[PDB]
Subunit: 24 residues, 3 copies
């Protein structure tokens, strides 16, 4: 399914969309 | 959601689009 | 299709899921 549409980037983890910024 | 470009570059999902990872690194 | 479900983040590249950590 689609990631949130909220001006933030997402990566795929554990069957979820997780913010990229958390890893940066 | 559709495939990302297949062009040797990594993409992340943003705003219902595929965006280059490199932009954020 | 789904990325691996293994506690790790993935990005999309070349029609595949590739570890985010490789790029960081
Ligand atoms: C210009 C913003 N770039 C990043 O924040 C960035 C880039 C990189 C990056 O370019 N890595 C290439 C080795 C890595 C990280 C990272 O490992 N953050 C952990 C807190 C962050």
């Amino acid at each position: 399914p689609e990631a949130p549409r909220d001006g933030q980037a997402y990566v795929r983890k554990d069957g979820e969309w997780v913010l990229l910024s958390t890893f940066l």
